[PDB]
């Protein structure tokens, strides 16, 4: 799948993961809203009464062309509140890099912790640990008044300081493309 000879594309999958309502859809809508019509496909949203998923692909202008191959990024997330683990497990199939979108709200601090234990455990299903996959932490919602300090959030999701961290206010685009740029850098660094 990653190499498509017929279209001369290399495909990478980036998953936005994190607790429900932390800003993953918003990140996806902002990125989509900025790509030119000729460089992206359809945004696809799947929903049963109980589960959800959301994705689209696009050709980032910022990446160069090896041997005539353009790069194509496929962005995925499970949006909304989760009732079943199934679509989280499946969203990680063939993942190349991960953006963890943590929430700043004080009453969402455990949810951040829980969501990261859950991702670690979903990775494990595929034989992957947190070291095997580029992970970027986005600490979203820097604007809300009682917003916890970045290091307190980072303390519960990445207690060893192993992952790049970035601030965002995704409703306004701040941090959104820096975060994507950071996870991409990591993904491409592995292919060299
Ligand atoms: N105050 C604030 N609200 C945000 C931010 N990002 C997203 N939201 C809001 O949080 C709610 C849930 O966001 P959404 O992206 O759907 O979360 P998802 O379930 O993780 O996809 C929505 O009403 C968003 O507008 C932010 O940076 N600051």
PDB file of N, CA and C and ligand atoms in Angstrom, residues 16-30 52 54 77-82 101-104 138-145 168-174 176, ligand 1:
ATOM      1  N   UNK A  16      -4.514  11.047  14.311  1.00  0.00           N
ATOM      2  CA  UNK A  16      -4.767  11.903  15.434  1.00  0.00           C
ATOM      3  C   UNK A  16      -5.535  11.081  16.462  1.00  0.00           C
ATOM      4  N   UNK A  17      -5.001  11.013  17.670  1.00  0.00           N
ATOM      5  CA  UNK A  17      -5.527  10.201  18.724  1.00  0.00           C
ATOM      6  C   UNK A  17      -5.577  11.109  19.934  1.00  0.00           C
ATOM      7  N   UNK A  18      -6.373  10.729  20.920  1.00  0.00           N
ATOM      8  CA  UNK A  18      -6.561  11.504  22.155  1.00  0.00           C
ATOM      9  C   UNK A  18      -7.985  11.306  22.679  1.00  0.00           C
ATOM     10  N   UNK A  19      -8.296  11.858  23.876  1.00  0.00           N
ATOM     11  CA  UNK A  19      -9.626  11.622  24.464  1.00  0.00           C
ATOM     12  C   UNK A  19     -10.697  12.330  23.624  1.00  0.00           C
ATOM     13  N   UNK A  20     -11.959  11.900  23.752  1.00  0.00           N
ATOM     14  CA  UNK A  20     -13.054  12.467  23.013  1.00  0.00           C
ATOM     15  C   UNK A  20     -13.129  13.945  23.313  1.00  0.00           C
ATOM     16  N   UNK A  21     -13.334  14.731  22.253  1.00  0.00           N
ATOM     17  CA  UNK A  21     -13.610  16.179  22.310  1.00  0.00           C
ATOM     18  C   UNK A  21     -12.411  17.013  22.618  1.00  0.00           C
ATOM     19  N   UNK A  22     -11.230  16.463  22.394  1.00  0.00           N
ATOM     20  CA  UNK A  22     -10.008  17.204  22.695  1.00  0.00           C
ATOM     21  C   UNK A  22      -9.561  18.136  21.565  1.00  0.00           C
ATOM     22  N   UNK A  23     -10.174  18.029  20.386  1.00  0.00           N
ATOM     23  CA  UNK A  23      -9.851  18.852  19.226  1.00  0.00           C
ATOM     24  C   UNK A  23      -9.299  18.156  17.972  1.00  0.00           C
ATOM     25  N   UNK A  24      -9.554  16.854  17.814  1.00  0.00           N
ATOM     26  CA  UNK A  24      -8.953  16.074  16.717  1.00  0.00           C
ATOM     27  C   UNK A  24      -9.637  16.401  15.368  1.00  0.00           C
ATOM     28  N   UNK A  25     -10.977  16.395  15.371  1.00  0.00           N
ATOM     29  CA  UNK A  25     -11.759  16.815  14.202  1.00  0.00           C
ATOM     30  C   UNK A  25     -11.397  18.236  13.795  1.00  0.00           C
ATOM     31  N   UNK A  26     -11.344  19.125  14.763  1.00  0.00           N
ATOM     32  CA  UNK A  26     -11.026  20.494  14.466  1.00  0.00           C
ATOM     33  C   UNK A  26      -9.664  20.616  13.748  1.00  0.00           C
ATOM     34  N   UNK A  27      -8.662  19.822  14.164  1.00  0.00           N
ATOM     35  CA  UNK A  27      -7.349  19.799  13.533  1.00  0.00           C
ATOM     36  C   UNK A  27      -7.482  19.364  12.113  1.00  0.00           C
ATOM     37  N   UNK A  28      -8.237  18.293  11.917  1.00  0.00           N
ATOM     38  CA  UNK A  28      -8.502  17.768  10.599  1.00  0.00           C
ATOM     39  C   UNK A  28      -9.251  18.755   9.706  1.00  0.00           C
ATOM     40  N   UNK A  29     -10.217  19.490  10.257  1.00  0.00           N
ATOM     41  CA  UNK A  29     -10.981  20.443   9.411  1.00  0.00           C
ATOM     42  C   UNK A  29     -10.131  21.638   9.000  1.00  0.00           C
ATOM     43  N   UNK A  30      -9.323  22.120   9.932  1.00  0.00           N
ATOM     44  CA  UNK A  30      -8.387  23.190   9.607  1.00  0.00           C
ATOM     45  C   UNK A  30      -7.371  22.758   8.551  1.00  0.00           C
ATOM     46  N   UNK A  52     -17.478   5.908  15.457  1.00  0.00           N
ATOM     47  CA  UNK A  52     -17.167   6.957  14.464  1.00  0.00           C
ATOM     48  C   UNK A  52     -15.757   6.847  13.957  1.00  0.00           C
ATOM     49  N   UNK A  54     -13.046   9.146  10.832  1.00  0.00           N
ATOM     50  CA  UNK A  54     -12.962  10.311   9.959  1.00  0.00           C
ATOM     51  C   UNK A  54     -11.604  10.386   9.341  1.00  0.00           C
ATOM     52  N   UNK A  77      -8.760   9.903  12.239  1.00  0.00           N
ATOM     53  CA  UNK A  77      -9.071   9.955  13.631  1.00  0.00           C
ATOM     54  C   UNK A  77     -10.408   9.255  14.002  1.00  0.00           C
ATOM     55  N   UNK A  78     -10.575   8.967  15.299  1.00  0.00           N
ATOM     56  CA  UNK A  78     -11.847   8.555  15.832  1.00  0.00           C
ATOM     57  C   UNK A  78     -12.349   9.787  16.574  1.00  0.00           C
ATOM     58  N   UNK A  79     -13.365  10.499  16.033  1.00  0.00           N
ATOM     59  CA  UNK A  79     -13.929  11.728  16.606  1.00  0.00           C
ATOM     60  C   UNK A  79     -15.025  11.469  17.629  1.00  0.00           C
ATOM     61  N   UNK A  80     -15.229  12.376  18.596  1.00  0.00           N
ATOM     62  CA  UNK A  80     -16.367  12.336  19.513  1.00  0.00           C
ATOM     63  C   UNK A  80     -16.088  11.469  20.743  1.00  0.00           C
ATOM     64  N   UNK A  81     -17.093  11.272  21.578  1.00  0.00           N
ATOM     65  CA  UNK A  81     -16.913  10.373  22.682  1.00  0.00           C
ATOM     66  C   UNK A  81     -17.000   8.904  22.227  1.00  0.00           C
ATOM     67  N   UNK A  82     -16.109   8.100  22.798  1.00  0.00           N
ATOM     68  CA  UNK A  82     -15.945   6.692  22.489  1.00  0.00           C
ATOM     69  C   UNK A  82     -16.741   5.845  23.508  1.00  0.00           C
ATOM     70  N   UNK A 101      -3.488  14.523  20.644  1.00  0.00           N
ATOM     71  CA  UNK A 101      -4.135  15.814  20.902  1.00  0.00           C
ATOM     72  C   UNK A 101      -4.701  15.796  22.320  1.00  0.00           C
ATOM     73  N   UNK A 102      -3.942  16.302  23.279  1.00  0.00           N
ATOM     74  CA  UNK A 102      -4.383  16.311  24.667  1.00  0.00           C
ATOM     75  C   UNK A 102      -5.241  17.559  24.984  1.00  0.00           C
ATOM     76  N   UNK A 103      -6.128  17.455  25.951  1.00  0.00           N
ATOM     77  CA  UNK A 103      -7.035  18.564  26.238  1.00  0.00           C
ATOM     78  C   UNK A 103      -6.399  19.403  27.366  1.00  0.00           C
ATOM     79  N   UNK A 104      -6.650  20.711  27.386  1.00  0.00           N
ATOM     80  CA  UNK A 104      -6.106  21.536  28.455  1.00  0.00           C
ATOM     81  C   UNK A 104      -7.049  21.621  29.653  1.00  0.00           C
ATOM     82  N   UNK A 138       0.244  17.244  21.050  1.00  0.00           N
ATOM     83  CA  UNK A 138      -0.289  18.577  20.913  1.00  0.00           C
ATOM     84  C   UNK A 138      -1.187  18.857  22.121  1.00  0.00           C
ATOM     85  N   UNK A 139      -0.803  19.882  22.870  1.00  0.00           N
ATOM     86  CA  UNK A 139      -1.522  20.276  24.015  1.00  0.00           C
ATOM     87  C   UNK A 139      -2.465  21.361  23.483  1.00  0.00           C
ATOM     88  N   UNK A 140      -3.727  20.977  23.299  1.00  0.00           N
ATOM     89  CA  UNK A 140      -4.702  21.835  22.631  1.00  0.00           C
ATOM     90  C   UNK A 140      -5.461  22.716  23.618  1.00  0.00           C
ATOM     91  N   UNK A 141      -6.111  23.762  23.109  1.00  0.00           N
ATOM     92  CA  UNK A 141      -6.958  24.653  23.937  1.00  0.00           C
ATOM     93  C   UNK A 141      -6.150  25.437  24.940  1.00  0.00           C
ATOM     94  N   UNK A 142      -5.151  26.169  24.437  1.00  0.00           N
ATOM     95  CA  UNK A 142      -4.264  26.946  25.302  1.00  0.00           C
ATOM     96  C   UNK A 142      -4.996  28.191  25.811  1.00  0.00           C
ATOM     97  N   UNK A 143      -6.159  28.489  25.201  1.00  0.00           N
ATOM     98  CA  UNK A 143      -6.928  29.721  25.434  1.00  0.00           C
ATOM     99  C   UNK A 143      -7.888  29.691  26.598  1.00  0.00           C
ATOM    100  N   UNK A 144      -8.435  28.522  26.903  1.00  0.00           N
ATOM    101  CA  UNK A 144      -9.437  28.494  27.939  1.00  0.00           C
ATOM    102  C   UNK A 144      -8.812  28.918  29.304  1.00  0.00           C
ATOM    103  N   UNK A 145      -9.578  29.693  30.080  1.00  0.00           N
ATOM    104  CA  UNK A 145      -9.187  30.410  31.318  1.00  0.00           C
ATOM    105  C   UNK A 145      -8.488  29.523  32.378  1.00  0.00           C
ATOM    106  N   UNK A 168      -1.409  24.430  21.058  1.00  0.00           N
ATOM    107  CA  UNK A 168      -2.359  24.768  20.013  1.00  0.00           C
ATOM    108  C   UNK A 168      -3.641  25.422  20.557  1.00  0.00           C
ATOM    109  N   UNK A 169      -4.356  26.083  19.657  1.00  0.00           N
ATOM    110  CA  UNK A 169      -5.733  26.512  19.846  1.00  0.00           C
ATOM    111  C   UNK A 169      -6.305  26.234  18.481  1.00  0.00           C
ATOM    112  N   UNK A 170      -6.867  25.046  18.349  1.00  0.00           N
ATOM    113  CA  UNK A 170      -7.149  24.439  17.049  1.00  0.00           C
ATOM    114  C   UNK A 170      -8.346  25.092  16.355  1.00  0.00           C
ATOM    115  N   UNK A 171      -9.245  25.674  17.151  1.00  0.00           N
ATOM    116  CA  UNK A 171     -10.375  26.442  16.588  1.00  0.00           C
ATOM    117  C   UNK A 171      -9.863  27.640  15.782  1.00  0.00           C
ATOM    118  N   UNK A 172      -8.606  28.035  16.035  1.00  0.00           N
ATOM    119  CA  UNK A 172      -8.022  29.199  15.398  1.00  0.00           C
ATOM    120  C   UNK A 172      -6.805  28.887  14.566  1.00  0.00           C
ATOM    121  N   UNK A 173      -6.450  27.607  14.429  1.00  0.00           N
ATOM    122  CA  UNK A 173      -5.332  27.225  13.548  1.00  0.00           C
ATOM    123  C   UNK A 173      -3.941  27.264  14.187  1.00  0.00           C
ATOM    124  N   UNK A 174      -3.821  27.887  15.358  1.00  0.00           N
ATOM    125  CA  UNK A 174      -2.545  27.975  16.026  1.00  0.00           C
ATOM    126  C   UNK A 174      -2.080  26.589  16.497  1.00  0.00           C
ATOM    127  N   UNK A 176      -1.577  24.075  14.663  1.00  0.00           N
ATOM    128  CA  UNK A 176      -2.093  22.990  13.810  1.00  0.00           C
ATOM    129  C   UNK A 176      -1.105  22.472  12.787  1.00  0.00           C
TER     130      UNK A 176
HETATM  131  N1  LIG B   1     -11.759  26.540  23.543  1.00  0.00           N
HETATM  132  C1  LIG B   1     -11.295  25.689  22.607  1.00  0.00           C
HETATM  133  N2  LIG B   1     -12.170  24.799  22.066  1.00  0.00           N
HETATM  134  C2  LIG B   1     -11.772  23.896  21.160  1.00  0.00           C
HETATM  135  C3  LIG B   1     -10.386  23.888  20.712  1.00  0.00           C
HETATM  136  N3  LIG B   1     -10.272  22.924  19.778  1.00  0.00           N
HETATM  137  C4  LIG B   1     -11.499  22.366  19.660  1.00  0.00           C
HETATM  138  N4  LIG B   1     -12.390  22.952  20.489  1.00  0.00           N
HETATM  139  C5  LIG B   1     -13.832  22.616  20.687  1.00  0.00           C
HETATM  140  O1  LIG B   1     -13.987  21.368  21.387  1.00  0.00           O
HETATM  141  C6  LIG B   1     -15.172  20.701  20.941  1.00  0.00           C
HETATM  142  C7  LIG B   1     -14.726  19.301  20.526  1.00  0.00           C
HETATM  143  O2  LIG B   1     -13.735  19.397  19.501  1.00  0.00           O
HETATM  144  P1  LIG B   1     -13.522  18.284  18.354  1.00  0.00           P
HETATM  145  O3  LIG B   1     -12.419  18.714  17.429  1.00  0.00           O
HETATM  146  O4  LIG B   1     -14.811  17.823  17.771  1.00  0.00           O
HETATM  147  O5  LIG B   1     -12.975  17.082  19.258  1.00  0.00           O
HETATM  148  P2  LIG B   1     -12.823  15.548  18.793  1.00  0.00           P
HETATM  149  O6  LIG B   1     -13.962  14.793  19.380  1.00  0.00           O
HETATM  150  O7  LIG B   1     -11.554  15.290  19.533  1.00  0.00           O
HETATM  151  O8  LIG B   1     -12.719  15.425  17.281  1.00  0.00           O
HETATM  152  C8  LIG B   1     -15.692  21.498  19.750  1.00  0.00           C
HETATM  153  O9  LIG B   1     -16.816  22.274  20.108  1.00  0.00           O
HETATM  154  C9  LIG B   1     -14.525  22.410  19.373  1.00  0.00           C
HETATM  155  O10 LIG B   1     -14.838  23.665  18.767  1.00  0.00           O
HETATM  156  C10 LIG B   1      -9.489  24.906  21.326  1.00  0.00           C
HETATM  157  O11 LIG B   1      -8.292  24.976  20.993  1.00  0.00           O
HETATM  158  N5  LIG B   1      -9.999  25.740  22.246  1.00  0.00           N
END
